[PDB]
Amino acid sequence: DPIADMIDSLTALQVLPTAANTEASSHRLGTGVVPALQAAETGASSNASDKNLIETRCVLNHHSTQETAIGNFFSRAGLVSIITMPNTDGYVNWDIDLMGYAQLRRKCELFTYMRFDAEFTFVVAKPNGVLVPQLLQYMYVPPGAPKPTSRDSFAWQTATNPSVFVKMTDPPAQVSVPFMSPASAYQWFYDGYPTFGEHLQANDLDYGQCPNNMMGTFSIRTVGTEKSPHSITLRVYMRIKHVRAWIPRPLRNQPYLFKTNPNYKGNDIKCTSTSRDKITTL
């Protein structure tokens, strides 16, 4: 070859089912060996242990680390939607956005990226909680599919769209939903704009909107041609299964205002801690 310059991770995983044992230690007097003095400017956490700062005994502990695994942290059904049919013509088209309730939103926004399968449960009743014999139909409308315009629309023929027929006196319906993003994970934070072009002030709503998370429309109706005399209230619950998560984030200390942006009330900034009077008196 005539041209010689054209010839040309740090850590690994380990299974830790229990917490770490403590070894016995004695006193230590000498120079040069100082495990208590650190340097926080390097960006590294402190590596000082119990046995280097005090005299310890031997503790064989069997405290399990299973519950803090992120599969056990997330596999709990939380509320994502409340849909009402008082919307007086017997059908609702609901655009799927699961960031409307603060408890599951703060848990998921601990991470930046997440990839999971879901399990949706549909708890339906009257607005006062009473149940009546009434037939309903839930339909998932993917993006691009025709959405229903009335109670007797042609889109309720559901020849390819997945649909569930259920009664109100039945147990709540459960379905499994796969991972269906065009990307490799869902992102709760998208720093940018979806399309090209000029970014004027009238189009500032486009900032932060990722189309890889937009999953379509969830439609409900009462099945018959005629109007039902019953009011409907549907509550949707979501379990997160088979989960992978990347890049932990600071947890939010401000109350949520809108579903699509991290906007916060600027006149009342909440402090993260509870205040006291003096630094010396607790």
Partner: protein, 242 residues
């Protein structure tokens, strides 16, 4: 068909129940995963990361909240004064609320294991001094003077080229796990009190400022665990989102 009997627990919806439900898309295959850096498998990996402790959580600091992240140290006239005092309870309201360990503890009911507090000195190169950082096991209030506070677990910190020191708070408890301490019967689960004292003075020459600041960072050790996952009390929702 096969003879069967239905038991209690039929037609209930338990939100923590793990089972098999019917799939909506037959033959669907997801997008293949690519390699992304920074994958988390366990929440104890996040709990070992040091985050800033808000020891200066005063009522006069609430409109200038950037001052809650550092507490001052100055030239003293009398000897043996205390600089700050706070509780070692990570799940209680106070300075531990601003840490990611004290935030992830709120999602669980009981905890166990040793803690660590790191103090970083942010004064001049020309400033010298020695501090006494003590941890007191439960039984009393804040110690009245320095000679009472050094009877517990302590470390003497000398300012120098290494600008940080670590006070390890060891697990000294009667029970194997601790619930979160609170005013009432749940003061049975208190951890103790961390105080910092002047061992010698904060000494400074001419031309360097007479007041410096210390940043406190806190994390957990490798024998730390949590259990009984529950709802947190930090976020609320009174008004509807959007």
């Amino acid at each position: 068909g096969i003879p069967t009997e239905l038991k209690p627990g039929t037609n209930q919806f338990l939100t923590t129940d793990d089972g098999v439900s019917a799939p909506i898309l037959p033959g669907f295959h997801p997008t293949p995963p690519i390699h992304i850096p920074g994958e988390v498998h366990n929440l104890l990996e996040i709990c070992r990361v040091e985050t800033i402790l808000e020891v200066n959580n005063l009522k006069t600091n609430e409109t200038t909240p950037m001052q809650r992240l550092c507490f001052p140290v100055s030239v003293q006239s009398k000897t043996g004064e205390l600089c700050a005092a706070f509780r070692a309870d990570p799940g209680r309201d106070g300075p531990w609320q601003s840490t990611i360990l004290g935030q992830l503890c709120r999602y669980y009911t009981q905890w166990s294991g040793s803690l660590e507090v790191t103090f970083m000195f942010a004064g001049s190169f020309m400033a010298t001094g020695k501090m006494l950082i003590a941890y007191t096991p439960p039984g009393g209030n804040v110690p009245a003077d320095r000679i009472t506070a050094m009877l517990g677990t302590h470390v003497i910190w000398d300012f120098g080229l290494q600008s940080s020191v670590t006070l390890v708070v060891p697990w000294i408890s009667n029970t194997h796990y601790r619930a979160h301490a609170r005013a009432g019967y749940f003061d049975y689960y208190t951890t103790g009190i961390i105080t910092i004292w002047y061992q010698t003075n904060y000494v400074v020459p001419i031309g360097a400022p007479t007041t410096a600041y210390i940043v406190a960072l806190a994390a957990a050790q490798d024998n730390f665990t949590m259990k009984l996952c529950k709802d947190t009390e930090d976020i609320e929702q009174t008004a509807n989102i959007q």
